[PDB]
Design a protein around this motif. Sequence first.
Motif, PDB file in Angstrom:
ATOM      1  N   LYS B  42      13.695  -0.918   6.768  1.00 21.81           N
ATOM      2  CA  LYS B  42      12.820   0.201   7.068  1.00 21.81           C
ATOM      3  C   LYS B  42      12.311   0.184   8.502  1.00 21.81           C
ATOM      4  O   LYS B  42      11.813  -0.825   8.988  1.00 21.81           O
ATOM      5  CB  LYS B  42      11.610   0.171   6.141  1.00 21.81           C
ATOM      6  CG  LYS B  42      11.896   0.145   4.654  1.00 21.81           C
ATOM      7  CD  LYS B  42      10.585  -0.061   3.919  1.00 21.81           C
ATOM      8  CE  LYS B  42      10.739  -0.028   2.416  1.00 21.81           C
ATOM      9  NZ  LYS B  42      11.240  -1.312   1.878  1.00 21.81           N
ATOM     10  N   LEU B  66       6.903   9.094   4.584  1.00 23.14           N
ATOM     11  CA  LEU B  66       7.568   8.712   3.346  1.00 23.14           C
ATOM     12  C   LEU B  66       8.797   9.541   2.990  1.00 23.14           C
ATOM     13  O   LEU B  66       9.655   9.092   2.244  1.00 23.14           O
ATOM     14  CB  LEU B  66       6.569   8.684   2.189  1.00 23.14           C
ATOM     15  CG  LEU B  66       5.447   7.663   2.379  1.00 23.14           C
ATOM     16  CD1 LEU B  66       4.601   7.527   1.125  1.00 23.14           C
ATOM     17  CD2 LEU B  66       6.022   6.317   2.779  1.00 23.14           C
ATOM     18  N   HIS B  69      11.475   7.790   5.038  1.00 23.43           N
ATOM     19  CA  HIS B  69      11.327   6.350   5.059  1.00 23.43           C
ATOM     20  C   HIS B  69      10.644   5.854   3.831  1.00 23.43           C
ATOM     21  O   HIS B  69       9.582   6.363   3.455  1.00 23.43           O
ATOM     22  CB  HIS B  69      10.602   5.920   6.318  1.00 23.43           C
ATOM     23  CG  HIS B  69      11.138   6.573   7.567  1.00 23.43           C
ATOM     24  ND1 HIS B  69      12.313   6.241   8.099  1.00 23.43           N
ATOM     25  CD2 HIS B  69      10.615   7.577   8.367  1.00 23.43           C
ATOM     26  CE1 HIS B  69      12.536   6.981   9.190  1.00 23.43           C
ATOM     27  NE2 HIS B  69      11.495   7.799   9.354  1.00 23.43           N
ATOM     28  N   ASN B  70      11.245   4.870   3.174  1.00 22.13           N
ATOM     29  CA  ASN B  70      10.724   4.369   1.909  1.00 22.13           C
ATOM     30  C   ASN B  70       9.651   3.272   2.012  1.00 22.13           C
ATOM     31  O   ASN B  70       9.842   2.164   1.543  1.00 22.13           O
ATOM     32  CB  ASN B  70      11.902   3.889   1.054  1.00 22.13           C
ATOM     33  CG  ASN B  70      11.584   3.843  -0.427  1.00 22.13           C
ATOM     34  OD1 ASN B  70      10.549   4.318  -0.878  1.00 22.13           O
ATOM     35  ND2 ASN B  70      12.492   3.271  -1.195  1.00 22.13           N
ATOM     36  N   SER B  72       5.952   1.592   1.062  1.00 22.47           N
ATOM     37  CA  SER B  72       5.125   1.575  -0.126  1.00 22.47           C
ATOM     38  C   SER B  72       3.743   1.038   0.207  1.00 22.47           C
ATOM     39  O   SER B  72       3.573   0.311   1.168  1.00 22.47           O
ATOM     40  CB  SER B  72       5.778   0.762  -1.238  1.00 22.47           C
ATOM     41  OG  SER B  72       6.104  -0.531  -0.798  1.00 22.47           O
TER      42      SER B  72
END
Lengths: 493, 493
Positions: B42, B66, B69-70, B72
Amino acid sequence: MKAKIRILDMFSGRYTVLINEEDAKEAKLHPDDLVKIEAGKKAVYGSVALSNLVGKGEVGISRDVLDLHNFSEGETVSVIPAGTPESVRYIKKKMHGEKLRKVEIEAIVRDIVDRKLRDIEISSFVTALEINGLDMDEIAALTIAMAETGDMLDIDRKPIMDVHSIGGVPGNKTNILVVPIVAAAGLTIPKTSSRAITSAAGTADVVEVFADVSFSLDEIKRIVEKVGACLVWGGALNLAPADDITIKAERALSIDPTGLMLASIMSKKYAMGSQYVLIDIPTGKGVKVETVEEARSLARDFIELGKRLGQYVEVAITYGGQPIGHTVGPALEAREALSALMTGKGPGSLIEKATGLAGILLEMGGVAPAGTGKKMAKEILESGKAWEKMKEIIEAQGGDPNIKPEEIPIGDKTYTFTAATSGYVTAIDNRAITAIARAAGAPEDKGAGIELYVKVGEKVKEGDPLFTIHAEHEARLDQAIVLARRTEPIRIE
Amino acid sequence: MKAKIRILDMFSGRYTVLINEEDAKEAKLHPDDLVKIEAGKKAVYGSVALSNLVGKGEVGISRDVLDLHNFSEGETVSVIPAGTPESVRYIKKKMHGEKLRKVEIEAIVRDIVDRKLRDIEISSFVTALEINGLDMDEIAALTIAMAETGDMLDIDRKPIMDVHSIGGVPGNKTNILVVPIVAAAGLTIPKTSSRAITSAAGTADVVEVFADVSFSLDEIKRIVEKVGACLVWGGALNLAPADDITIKAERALSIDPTGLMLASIMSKKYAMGSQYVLIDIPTGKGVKVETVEEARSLARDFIELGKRLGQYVEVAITYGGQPIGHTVGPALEAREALSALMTGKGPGSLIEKATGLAGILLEMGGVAPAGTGKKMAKEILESGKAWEKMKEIIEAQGGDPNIKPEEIPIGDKTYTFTAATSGYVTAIDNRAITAIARAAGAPEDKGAGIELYVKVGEKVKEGDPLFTIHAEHEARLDQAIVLARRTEPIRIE
Ligand SMILES: Nc1ncnc2c1ncn2[C@@H]1O[C@H](COP(=O)(O)O)[C@@H](O)[C@H]1O
Ligand SMILES: Nc1ncnc2c1ncn2[C@@H]1O[C@H](COP(=O)(O)O)[C@@H](O)[C@H]1O
């Protein structure tokens, strides 16, 4: 959209308005929309941001809005979408290569101060200026408008002397010597400096190492009246505010268009009330002016422009072929400037340039007879007089007057390049040197930079250190080293 | 600097990273600084804003990040200051009037998609292109890179037909007719359109009045496969993603640099998978191409560019001297386009242009014998076949298939300009007309625009209505009236 003001603690570097997502949807407001926030007379232009951070009926204004305005918490305000400024049309005219009217130039600058014009528009105008240029009429108009849009410093002393460099040449901490020397002679020299634009360290960056450089104009008056000089950041205050905004675009693009540069330095001088101004133009390979003909031409512009502002301007065309002194980057340059002042001793390139510049000012100021200014400057420096004056400036500016220069911190990570072969240095590439210093983290990391052990025409033996790279972080140091290997900044025949 | 992700409900129209003030001081981070946020694979580039909204060791990222782009919540991330991007040098090389190498161009595009280059750099690039231009090698290099930068639509149909207009001429809702007509003939035509750049309304703005225009690639594939066509916003999907970012600067500055325009349209066609492309070039006074010889040159560029992309390109040089049809602005244009499809009857300028363009595509498509395409298109329009296809596109796009064009709301604030003298209309100023319509609030206010009652060569009597201005807001209407009064768009002799 009518709302109550909530002050949000964030600095985005732009005027940010937080709008409720439900409120924004209702009002047809989109992210980065230009809006005007007004109560009574009071008005501000902000860029829209949508968030749930703000409750319904609530508008959030960033802390940036606070400095030049007066909005209270909970105060009712009207939020209205704002149209594209008429001035964009003028920006478009410059883009097409057309000369701008004074009124058009005035409109763009006020729009810049107003924040009606934002990064896209400002960058476009700066790019246009860089490609298409300005004539003397446009520059004079631009300078005056920039100055008029801000406050003007009022100093009870006169005449007011000033010095400014167009920079470009690496490690140009020279004026740090010059101001204390001129002030020491009793002349009034309130100096303003920008941060780095095309370089590793702007003078403000260097001074900031050992003293505060951000002051209000009122604070500046008190310091100058008491001490007779200052070394402050031009940006920190409402002097030529249009200039501070414009520089940011220039800094991002690594450009300093000459017409804009002339307007930027001179507008600050006019705002400060400077009457006698000395301009330094580093000339040579790797800098803003390659040739003497180019320097002479640039000098005439500075002189003509000053004459239009009612200022007496003298220009020194100096050698910019290589770095001045032995240091690049804020802490290293500061250490070099401070020690040279305190001991009266330092690199010949720095001392000779500084004494020569200070000497011109001393003669201009009438404190030195014709042809004796440089010598008088040397005596002031050598006697420790400039140092005593510098201590005062530093104390007035929140610094420690008892500072020990050799004790100032520099980048922890280091790597030293050594001469591959025996020989003599035939060249030093200024652009390569700046790029490496920047890779090291300058000027954001004050410790970062280059220490240079060699200069042109100097004999060297194999394994002789040429320069050391300083960096706070290992990653930055490695990048600088990688860049250094490709560039080969120091050339030995 | 190591930190943990906090996702914040903020949408600024840019990737904004919130950094704690104490943390920022330690990391030497200042507002508007570019930072790279890294986890494993990422990576995201964001713009720093200092805030007390986030704790020490916390970086606040907008929920916007988000999407591509993942990240969390609570994920350990690395926050490092990003150096000025290398591509800035290339942008600078362009400012200096140099030709860009393929690698240099590719680097600029990678940087744009990465969000590494922001508004200042992008605006600088667009402005530099506008002043200095691009040659065919560069444009071809730019187009392929932009296309390559994004996803490719896979549609299980061939050949794929497409139509695109360079715009400029006001009231060009023409392709709105063309797509349903070509699709009615059973041809596959997945159209993408930008919002307004230099105009009062982009085709996307007009279509949005009656249907949703933002779709995922998966949705586009579903609609086109089922319906055989679509009328969608190019910006909303990851095809030539670089193009969407550049257009914002273009919209703000009201410029459509030609090399950029070619790369933008063609990259999208290529990404879409279009094999046969029809390009419309409105030619005349007040538009991007003044003359036929100029149009032919631009036509050659589109054709050669298409050949490099393995596409068959045909160009129609249409008359752009005056507004197409009788309407300018999104709701008015929609009413005119939908009504023309539904009744088969509308302004001659619109129907004739639309059928002619559709006809070229029908012949290219092989659905019409050489020279019968325009006639075939007219039959398709008059029979209601185009309308039935349009109803399908609209339903698939979330619109009401049964909407009545007459019933679409338009701005309720109006003023009508009438003929000062008797005579014949000899000219209509497109530039003035678009400006007035924009002043009215178009395209942001869908209702806003101009209804034009007269066309060139038409005899008029003193007091005959010339045009009517529509606005959703009184202030917007008043500014438009002022421009119109100063402008005097209609010339009577
Ligand atoms: N356009 C400008 N406006 C203000 N200061 C400038 C300008 N150009 C050069 N300078 C001075 O030179 C340094 C910045 O230029 P550079 O060396 O290119 O980063 C600072 O110390 C400034 O005071
Ligand atoms: N560079 C471009 N990229 C995408 N679409 C464009 C471009 N230039 C013109 N257009 C089309 O023409 C209209 C926008 O251009 P304008 O007429 O200048 O607002 C939209 O309907 C677009 O689809």
